[PDB]
Design a protein around this ligand. Sequence first.
Ligand SMILES: *[C@H]1O[C@H](CO)[C@@H](O[C@@H]2O[C@@H](C)[C@H](O)[C@@H](O)[C@H]2O)[C@H](O)[C@@H]1O[C@H]1O[C@H](C(=O)O)[C@@H](O[C@@H]2OC[C@@H](O[C@@H]3O[C@@H](C)[C@@H](O[C@@H]4O[C@H](CO)[C@@H](O)[C@H](O)[C@H]4O)[C@@H](O[C@H]4O[C@H](CO)[C@H](O)[C@H](O)[C@H]4O)[C@@H]3OC)[C@H](O)[C@H]2O)[C@H](O)[C@H]1O
Ligand SMILES: CC(=O)N[C@@H]1[C@@H](O[C@@H]2OC(C(=O)O)=C[C@H](O)[C@H]2O)[C@@H](OS(=O)(=O)O)[C@@H](CO)O[C@@H]1O
Ligand SMILES: CC(=O)N[C@@H]1[C@@H](O[C@@H]2OC(C(=O)O)=C[C@H](O)[C@H]2O)[C@@H](OS(=O)(=O)O)[C@@H](CO)O[C@H]1O
Ligand SMILES: CC(=O)N[C@@H]1[C@@H](O[C@@H]2OC(C(=O)O)=C[C@H](O)[C@H]2O)[C@@H](OS(=O)(=O)O)[C@@H](CO)O[C@H]1O
Ligand SMILES: CC(=O)N[C@@H]1[C@@H](O[C@@H]2OC(C(=O)O)=C[C@H](O)[C@H]2O)[C@@H](OS(=O)(=O)O)[C@@H](CO)O[C@H]1O
Ligand SMILES: [Ca+2]
Length: 481
Amino acid sequence: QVVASNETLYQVVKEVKPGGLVQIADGTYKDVQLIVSNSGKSGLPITIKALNPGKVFFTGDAKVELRGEHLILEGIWFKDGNRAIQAWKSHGPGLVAIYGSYNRITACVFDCFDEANSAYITTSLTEDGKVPQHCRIDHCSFTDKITFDQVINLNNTARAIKDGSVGGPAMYHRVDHCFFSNPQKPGNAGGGIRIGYYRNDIGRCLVDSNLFMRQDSEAEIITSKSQENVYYGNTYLNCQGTMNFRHGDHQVAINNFYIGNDQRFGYGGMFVWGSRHVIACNYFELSETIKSRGNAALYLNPGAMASEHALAFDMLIANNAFINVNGYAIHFNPLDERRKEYCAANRLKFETPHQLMLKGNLFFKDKPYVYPFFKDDYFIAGKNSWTGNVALGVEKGIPVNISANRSAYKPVKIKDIQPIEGIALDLNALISKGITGKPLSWDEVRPYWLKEMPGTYALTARLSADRAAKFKAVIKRNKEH
Ligand SMILES: *[C@H]1O[C@H](CO)[C@@H](O[C@@H]2O[C@@H](C)[C@H](O)[C@@H](O)[C@H]2O)[C@H](O)[C@@H]1O[C@H]1O[C@H](C(=O)O)[C@@H](O[C@@H]2OC[C@@H](O[C@@H]3O[C@@H](C)[C@@H](O[C@@H]4O[C@H](CO)[C@@H](O)[C@H](O)[C@H]4O)[C@@H](O[C@H]4O[C@H](CO)[C@H](O)[C@H](O)[C@H]4O)[C@@H]3OC)[C@H](O)[C@H]2O)[C@H](O)[C@H]1O
Ligand SMILES: CC(=O)N[C@@H]1[C@@H](O[C@@H]2OC(C(=O)O)=C[C@H](O)[C@H]2O)[C@@H](OS(=O)(=O)O)[C@@H](CO)O[C@@H]1O
Ligand SMILES: CC(=O)N[C@@H]1[C@@H](O[C@@H]2OC(C(=O)O)=C[C@H](O)[C@H]2O)[C@@H](OS(=O)(=O)O)[C@@H](CO)O[C@H]1O
Ligand SMILES: CC(=O)N[C@@H]1[C@@H](O[C@@H]2OC(C(=O)O)=C[C@H](O)[C@H]2O)[C@@H](OS(=O)(=O)O)[C@@H](CO)O[C@H]1O
Ligand SMILES: CC(=O)N[C@@H]1[C@@H](O[C@@H]2OC(C(=O)O)=C[C@H](O)[C@H]2O)[C@@H](OS(=O)(=O)O)[C@@H](CO)O[C@H]1O
Ligand SMILES: [Ca+2]
């Protein structure tokens, strides 16, 4: 039914049946506490949507909880929030918290919501430990986030100091066609998306066709902290951060675009911990790279095998292109001094990346940047395997013989790569095709009803005066008195 107030919305959601449709009349729903406990059924979802998307605002001291299964939340604009700062935390539920499985949030806008620390959307465990699975977040816009924590956390365990061999279960979520552009916070402030917590967690989430444009929240654009997540066809445009395989082996990134096209800041880029990954058909063209990480497109972590800073080794790096990177194409030992400190403290064995299979990559420069393609301060003959690469335009920086024949450059065919269970992509086929398509634009990901890009930061790299003032107040209250 059509509802036009908070109270009527609360009532209709208590009664709605599988296949039901709740439409919210034009207006502002201030301090709205939408808790949806009922469930739809497979093929009979319950849809809660604006009657006219773009005309419904959830504001004030608001929250949404999707606790039932088979629910769809659509066409809501979250702005002008005022949740209690003492009542919300990073690593807690999001503004929208999804506790049930088979739920979808689509074509919603989150724009500088408030000053309370939390994600904008989470999947969250219930108190009895049940893990939501098979959820989708798509065609949503996340802009000008001025609070701590990620924009989205996808959770399969409760936060703990941890380290017990039993990880969280596979989630099988999808995040697609979303737009992220958010200002830099201080420190380890929470990024774009976190998936899982530690290396025994299984993710099996698909993150595809998103546009991260000045996603600058903190060092990590995405902190992927579970196994077997697949990142396909995302665009990272002028982002002050890197997309990271932070914990969890056997993750996949194929045909993403990492573009930096001005000199305003250092941009990234991928930072990779762990082993057994597939990193293929990605395109890196970065006009400036990140000083603090080591100035590179692709960073391969040194350290102790399978530790808290897991050594990057034994993986496939295939058919990628590094075009006019103002930095190393590949840095084989970033942050090595900090990592030796970690390994010494914990009495762990420090190692450097090896057993890498570098196949069919193009390394090309014709602009006067000063960096050789590679940095490997621990180079050992034979430790990695290079086949079918092409390198031309600057010295390699390591003693490896690579063809310089660009005309003869072709991506390699690959046929031995196992797909990820639950994700309907043919990894061999996609890798063997080489790099397809081009960077995504706002029109390709935007909510169907929204023509104008929201936010103040994406086009300008600066918050508007009023939002800047709120951001300063958040940062101040979160640091030492
Ligand atoms: C993410 O998305 C981006 C693009 O937004 C992709 O970008 C590309 O790749 C990047 C690497 C590059 O950077 C970029 O430049 C791009 O080149 C990126 O790869 C990622 O892709 C994934 O997301 C896509 C997306 O969501 O946009 C997926 O594309 C969708 O795939 C499904 C398509 O639907 C099918 O085709 C349409 C036209 C429907 O079929 C037609 O149905 C008509 C009416 O029934 C009929 O007359 C026609 O004969 C049919 O052809 C659809 O059918 C389904 O729906 C209809 C109603 O419309 C009926 O109910 C049917 O029963 C039902 O089957 C087809 O579904 C199979 C959709 O068009 C397409 O957008 C992509 O596959 C993902 O990998
Ligand atoms: C709630 C939702 O859309 N979940 C996504 C899931 O889609 C469900 O499962 C399938 C399926 O064929 O396995 C189809 C329907 O779209 C839906 O029931 C699926 O999303 S996808 O279909 O857009 O690809 C996965 C990705 O595999 O992500 C969510 O789990
Ligand atoms: C709110 C927030 O997450 N801020 C990050 C800092 O964490 C807070 O401050 C401290 C502290 O001892 O100084 C401890 C608590 O975690 C928070 O109250 C801190 O993050 S972290 O180091 O704890 O992971 C700094 C580190 O640079 O990052 C801020 O973003
Ligand atoms: C100890 C702790 O929980 N600190 C939180 C951070 O987590 C550490 O940092 C990261 C990371 O990739 O940033 C990985 C380590 O394994 C963690 O011990 C971090 O939280 S999270 O969202 O990345 O899990 C920050 C983010 O705001 O929050 C700290 O409190
Ligand atoms: C406790 C810990 O190792 N946390 C990792 C982060 O490391 C801290 O972050 C930084 C920084 O500027 O990024 C400075 C502090 O001295 C570090 O202790 C960080 O890891 S990394 O930067 O060493 O690679 C994040 C990933 O960005 O992961 C945390 O686990
Ligand atoms: Ca972080």
